[PDB]
Design an enzyme around this catalytic site. Structure first.
Site, mmCIF file in Angstrom:
data_model
loop_
_atom_site.group_PDB
_atom_site.id
_atom_site.type_symbol
_atom_site.label_atom_id
_atom_site.label_comp_id
_atom_site.label_asym_id
_atom_site.label_seq_id
_atom_site.Cartn_x
_atom_site.Cartn_y
_atom_site.Cartn_z
ATOM 1 N N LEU A 46 0.769 -1.236 -0.092
ATOM 2 C CA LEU A 46 0.042 0.096 0.112
ATOM 3 C C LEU A 46 0.768 1.202 -0.001
ATOM 4 C CD1 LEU A 46 0.243 1.312 3.084
ATOM 5 C CD2 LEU A 46 -1.436 -0.710 3.584
ATOM 6 N N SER A 47 0.302 2.265 -0.399
ATOM 7 C CA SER A 47 0.897 3.715 -0.600
ATOM 8 C C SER A 47 0.069 4.770 -0.072
ATOM 9 C CB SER A 47 1.498 3.778 -2.035
ATOM 10 O OG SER A 47 2.149 2.621 -2.298
ATOM 11 N N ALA A 48 -0.426 4.480 1.128
ATOM 12 C CA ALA A 48 -1.315 5.632 1.801
ATOM 13 C C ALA A 48 -0.516 7.180 1.595
ATOM 14 C CB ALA A 48 -1.496 5.436 3.241
#
Lengths: 279, 723, 84, 87, 97
Positions: free
Chosen positions: A54-56
């Site tokens: 993920l890359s919030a």
């Protein structure tokens, strides 16, 4: 904290708009990140661990910016992962969106369902929006069933291989937008006609290239196929209209919902479900 | 919140199939939802009230079901009642939905039906039906449906999806198996001691088939079933195994009398019994072995010279027992193995060398071949090869076979050329190495070369006229097979010819070193007496004697004088004079002698001999003036003496061949223990010769002693081979 | 029409392979007499092989298992006969 | 092939069976001892129910777009309560 | 997509459908078939306009948009339509109206 980094991203104009602002505050970083650490979602670093990618942080800030997400359109997520961004986009789109995602590892999918149930049952922002819950399928990013209808907004969750580029262009509805880190370079693509496309760059990003299929002599290729589009049933519709009405009143008065929803002349199971979605 | 005013009426109308108005059927849908919503404990009570209602109906149902005293009425009542109940089972889960196929009320119905109406009456239900089956076995053609229905009921009561084999299996099948076992066990005595094994076997087989038919007719064969196997197993235990010890009693009687038809039932019924087949195989094997040995063991020694009777008896035994095995046991592999073992146990008791002798009587100019055509001779040889295919000592045949073939082809006493040539294909069929098979072709090529050389000599030298010259030039092994190279004086016509023959074959044919054997040579010479002229066809020794007598027939020459003239030894001259003076079954004797003798040994040096002036060919007891007389006979063949020497050779092979087997193992086994070598010998020796270990041990010891086989220095029980 | 002479003369004789009939490479006797290989190099019973060479079986009758040779020449024996 | 639906106002609507049979309860009725008098459903609610059915039967094959289905707050509560009784 | 349409007569209403290229007489025949009702002094009227006896295409005012599944295009069937029962519901306190 979440609001700290949200302010920083607005400062770097990585948020800018109000819709994305509300989405980002609604969801707390670390919630969707692994159980052991719960610290580093608040930092622009690598969030690749195990199978989670993920890359919030500002990466997803940029992606949300590139994608307009006006209510009522349809968003398709290739490489959903832990569902962080599917959740955020659902916050914006509204009840009558079409929100589908596809993933390669089933254990991560079980993880994502666990996280959604966590969010519904514990978050505070849920009853501030007409959320759109994402639905999931297991499969590879390059083997979608061949007869799909089309999708207005398409996003690639990881590095995209040039020799499949058009394989995705064919999926985009006339007029839609596609966001992808092709060659780890973030870009937007627009279907301006039946057989014409146009593109622009965004930013030089870092991503892991996807894994290509290797199955043969089987119906894996271009077969996976997204969840069926279905016209829901009357309890959900009526629930939504009643919740609209009460939130509108409360907006006027502001110039708590749970208390209102409990005095309504309704059977107790109806109180719990038809409005409260079981708290 | 009291809707239990219309609902009890409408429920009890549903259950008993009383007429229901559509309006009620619609209204029941609305009321139940009404109660489940505006309340807090509807969900826990609707079905308790429902359970009470169903249970009251079921109690009335037991009252009615038991109200009947007859068995058929009771069964029919249970069937119809379950029938209506099950038809309505699907009719009242529609309302009452979502209170917890998979419906609540269906589970309630089936669990209550069984716990309140089945368990209680059941004691009767599965009994009466079974009695009907018994009546059927007594000739009472009862309506099969009366039982079938009960079956279909049990399988349904098992509401459990994960294990449905609870009611039908527990409370029906056991009854059928128990009743079948009781009936057959208590009915067997009517025939166990009232008739013989054959009739009892027929009765048991018929009953087994009938009860199998009943098993498929009545027992559930849905899938896992396995029902038929248990009923059939119990039936076989009751009928067959209970009398097997007495059934096997007549097996020997049937086998001895060759009653193959009766053995059909015996085998068929005992194939079902796991431990009832071995006795019959053992009986067959021991019967065959004893029937063969009791005569063959004596015949092997008392026969002595009559090979024909021995071979014919072996063939008769083989054919009879093969027919018995083929017919009685339907060519079953186990009984074929028993037959093979029995044949081996008989034919191997020590060497069937006589078989080879038989081939000679089928391949030589003898009365047996003279009355048979070539095809019949081949058919008879088929018997010899069939016998050879069984005996472990196979190589004993080849000794005598090759001796006889050599003497037949070399002495020109073969019955026919084509029958001899057929022996090539015969030996190939037997499976002998080509080295021996091609000997006939090699010998024929050598004979052709001999004829060519004789023609070449005749064309150049023309003593005996070239037209009458027949010189044999054959391979060295064809004639030089003994150390008794006795040479005799020859007539002038041959003494003036042999030097020229030797010169011609030495110079015109460099390399081919001719060598003469006067013992096997013969010829025809004309002689005259006071009663008429004649021709004598006699061996070379007789020819020399009669040539010495030719210029002085009327004189008297002593035994020693004849010896000196012919330069013959004692034995050869004695035999020649015995064949000339006392030829068996000869009307006239070539020579006369003064003293009286009983055998050749009685001849003395001073015994005088003379030419018989009355000797001539005799036809119809009349003296002829001309004709040919042949007086060679056995003189140029061999006597029981051969049987001795050949026998020695056989013994030699019993060693050598066995040793060869050992070598063939070690050439394939570079290092192996003694036990491994012995085990390999078991299979290897079957092709050439298989003696007992009492000689194999000494043969292995001889092989190792002669520095042919190596032994591990640290292990005397391991043999090693090198190179 | 042969009547009086030895018209059916069975002149039994045998031949042994050699390079010439003037000398003997395995004997010291006349070429037309029995071989001396079994006496000088130690009767002479001569047997034939598939290779068309004479040999002596004085001991090979039981020793051929390991002595399958032709002492009268330089070639091994190919078994043709095992009887008399 | 037309199953009429009649409310408690003596009121009538016409709908064919393939359209109508998309709820469990309506199958259950007529699956056991057409017309269908819904005792506890007024006329005005039933009209909107029928329209929803026909709308779903039409949009089952929806491609990607979604229209909106207006419900007025005057009858919304009663549609909520009459909705779960049919599905 | 076809067109959702709703017709009235007294206490009986019809849901029905057709093409834009259809004529009025086709609707008359659909109605006469479903109801088995021959024209004994009854025809098809649009918001109360006679449309004579039908068999026309030029006056089709039921354009597709007005005959949607979410909302019918209404047909006006001596005429008398019983309307429904108006919602007996109030704001109910929780809806300040």
């Amino acid at each position: 904290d979440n609001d700290d980094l949200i302010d920083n991203l607005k400062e770097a104009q990585y948020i800018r708009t109000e819709r994305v602002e509300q989405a980002f505050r609604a969801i707390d970083r670390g919630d969707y990140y692994l159980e052991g650490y719960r610290d580093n979602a608040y930092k622009d670093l690598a969030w690749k661990h195990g199978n989670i990618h993920l890359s919030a942080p500002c990466i997803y800030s940029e992606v949300m910016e590139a994608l307009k997400l006006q209510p009522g359109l349809s968003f398709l997520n290739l490489g959903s992962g832990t569902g962080y961004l599917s959740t955020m986009v659902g916050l914006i789109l509204g009840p009558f969106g079409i929100n589908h995602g596809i993933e390669l590892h089933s254990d991560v999918v079980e993880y994502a369902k666990e996280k959604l149930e966590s969010f519904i049952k514990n978050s505070d922002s849920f009853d501030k929006f007409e959320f759109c819950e994402p639905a999931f399928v297991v499969g590879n990013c390059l083997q979608i069933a061949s007869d799909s209808h089309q999708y207005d907004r398409i996003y690639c969750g990881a590095g995209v291989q040039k020799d499949h580029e058009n394989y995705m262009k064919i999926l985009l509805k006339v007029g839609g937008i596609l966001v992808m880190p092709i060659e780890d370079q973030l870009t937007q693509i627009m279907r301006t006609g039946q057989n014409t496309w146009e593109s622009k760059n965004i930013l030089a990003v870092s991503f892991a290239p996807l894994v290509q299929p290797s199955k043969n002599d089987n119906g894996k290729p271009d077969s996976v196929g997204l969840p069926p589009c279905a016209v829901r049933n009357l309890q959900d519709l009526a629930r939504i209209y009643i919740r609209r009405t009460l939130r509108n009143f409360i907006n006027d008065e502001m110039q708590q919902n749970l208390l209102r929803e409990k005095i309504m002349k309704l059977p107790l199971p109806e109180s719990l479900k038809a409005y409260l979605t079981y708290f | 919140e009291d809707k239990w005013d219309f609902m009890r009426p409408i429920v009890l109308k549903l259950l008993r199939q009383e007429s229901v108005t559509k309006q009620q059927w619609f209204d029941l849908f609305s009321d139940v939802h009404a109660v489940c919503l505006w309340d807090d404990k509807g969900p826990a009570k609707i079905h308790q009230a429902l359970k009470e209602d169903i249970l009251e109906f079921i109690k009335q149902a037991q009252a009615r079901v038991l109200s009947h005293q007859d068995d058929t009425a009771l069964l029919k009542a249970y069937i119809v009642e379950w029938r209506k109940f099950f038809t309505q089972c699907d009719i009242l889960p529609k309302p009452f939905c979502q209170l917890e196929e998979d419906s609540i009320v269906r589970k309630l119905m089936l669990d209550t039906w069984n716990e309140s109406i089945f368990s209680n009456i059941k004691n009767r239900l599965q009994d009466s039906a079974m009695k009907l089956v018994h009546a059927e076995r007594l000739g009472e053609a009862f309506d099969s449906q009366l039982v079938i229905g009960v079956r279909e009921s049990y399988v349904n009561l098992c509401s459990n999806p994960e294990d449905k084999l609870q009611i039908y299996r527990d409370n029906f099948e056991k009854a059928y198996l128990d009743s079948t076992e009781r009936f057959y066990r208590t009915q067997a005595p009517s025939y166990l001691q009232q008739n013989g094994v054959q009739n009892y076997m027929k009765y048991a087989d018929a009953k087994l088939k009938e009860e199998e038919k009943r098993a498929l007719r009545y027992l559930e064969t849905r899938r896992e079933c396995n029902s038929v196997e248990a009923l059939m197993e119990c039936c076989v235990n009751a009928l067959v195994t209970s009398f097997k010890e007495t059934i096997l009693a007549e097996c020997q009687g049937m086998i001895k009398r060759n009653e193959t038809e009766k053995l059909h039932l015996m085998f068929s019924l005992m194939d079902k019994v796991p431990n009832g087949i071995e006795p019959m195989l053992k009986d067959l094997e021991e019967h065959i072995i004893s029937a063969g040995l009791a005569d063959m063991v004596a015949a092997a020694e008392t026969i002595t010279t009559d090979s024909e009777k021995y071979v014919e008896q072996l063939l008769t035994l083989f054919n009879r027992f093969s027919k018995l095995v083929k017919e009685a046991f339907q060519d079953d592999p186990r009984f074929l193995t028993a037959r093979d073992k029995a044949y081996k146990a008989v034919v191997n008791d020590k060497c069937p060398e006589l078989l080879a002798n038989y081939c000679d009587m089928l391949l030589r100019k003898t009365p047996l071949s003279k009355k048979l055509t070539s095809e019949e001779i081949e058919a008879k040889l088929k018997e010899v090869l069939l016998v050879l295919k069984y005996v472990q000592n196979k190589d004993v045949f080849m000794r005598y076979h090759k001796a006889h073939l050599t003497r037949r082809l070399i002495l020109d006493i073969s019955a026919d050329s084509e029958i001899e040539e057929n022996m090539v294909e015969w030996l190939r069929e037997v499976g002998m190495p080509a080295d021996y098979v091609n000997k006939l072709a090699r010998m024929f090529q050598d004979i052709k070369v001999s004829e060519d050389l004789n023609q070449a000599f005749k064309e150049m030298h023309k003593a005996l006229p070239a037209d009458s010259v027949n010189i044999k030039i054959l391979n060295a092994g064809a004639w030089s097979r003994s150390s008794e190279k006795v040479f005799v004086s020859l007539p002038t016509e041959l003494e003036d010819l042999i030097p020229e023959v030797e010169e011609f074959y030495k110079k015109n044919h460099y390399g081919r070193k001719l060598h003469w054997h006067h013992l096997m040579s013969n010829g025809i010479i004309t002689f005259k007496n006071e009663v008429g002229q004649y021709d004598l066809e006699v061996t070379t020794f007789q020819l020399a004697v009669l040539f010495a007598w030719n210029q002085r027939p009327r004189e008297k020459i002593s035994f020693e004088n004849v010896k000196l003239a012919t330069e013959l030894p004692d034995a050869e001259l004695r035999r020649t004079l015995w064949s000339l003076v006392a030829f068996p079954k000869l009307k006239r004797q070539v020579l006369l002698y003064e003293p009286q003798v009983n055998s050749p040994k009685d001849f003395t040096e001073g015994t005088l001999f003379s030419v018989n002036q009355e000797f001539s060919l005799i036809k119809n007891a009349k003296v002829q003036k001309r004709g040919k007389i042949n007086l060679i006979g056995r003189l140029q063949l061999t006597t029981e003496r051969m049987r001795e020497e050949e026998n020695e050779g056989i013994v030699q092979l019993r060693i050598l061949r066995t040793q060869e087997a050992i070598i063939q193992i070690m050439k394939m086994r570079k290092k192996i223990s003694n036990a491994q070598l012995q085990t390999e010998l078991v299979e290897i020796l079957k092709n050439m010769f298989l003696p007992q270990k009492k000689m194999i041990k000494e043969q292995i010891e001889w092989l190792i002693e002669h520095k042919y086989i190596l032994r591990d220095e640290s292990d005397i029980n391991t043999f090693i081979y090198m190179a | 029409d042969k009547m009086f002479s030895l018209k059916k003369w069975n002149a039994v004789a045998m031949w042994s392979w050699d390079v010439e009939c003037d000398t003997c490479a395995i004997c010291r006797v006349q070429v037309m007499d029995a071989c001396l290989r079994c006496q000088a190099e130690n009767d002479c019973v001569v047997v034939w092989g598939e290779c068309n060479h004479s040999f002596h079986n004085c001991c090979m009758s039981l020793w051929v298992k390991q002595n399958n040779r032709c002492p009268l020449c330089q070639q091994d024996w190919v078994v043709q006969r095992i009887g008399k | 092939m037309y199953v009429k639906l009649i409310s408690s106002d003596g009121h009538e609507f016409i709908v064919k069976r393939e359209h109508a049979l998309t709820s469990g309860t309506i199958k259950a009725m007529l699956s056991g001892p057409n017309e269908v008098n819904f005792r506890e459903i007024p006329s005005h609610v039933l009209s909107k129910v029928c329209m929803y059915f026909t709308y779903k039967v039409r949009y089952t094959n929806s491609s990607t777009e979604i229209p909106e289905f207006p419900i007025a707050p005057e009858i919304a509560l009663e549609l909520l309560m009459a909705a779960n009784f049919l599905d | 997509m076809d067109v959702f349409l709703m017709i009235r007569r007294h206490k009986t209403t019809i849901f029905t459908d057709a093409k834009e290229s259809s004529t009025v007489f086709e609707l008359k025949r659909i109605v006469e078939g479903i109801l088995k009702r021959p024209p004994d002094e009854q025809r098809l009227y649009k918001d109360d306009q006679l449309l004579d006896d039908g068999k026309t295409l030029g006056e089709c005012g039921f354009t597709s948009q007005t005959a949607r599944p979410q909302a019918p295009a209404t047909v006006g069937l001596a005429l008398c339509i019983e309307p429904f029962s108006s919602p007996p519901e109030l704001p109910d306190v929780m809806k300040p109206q």
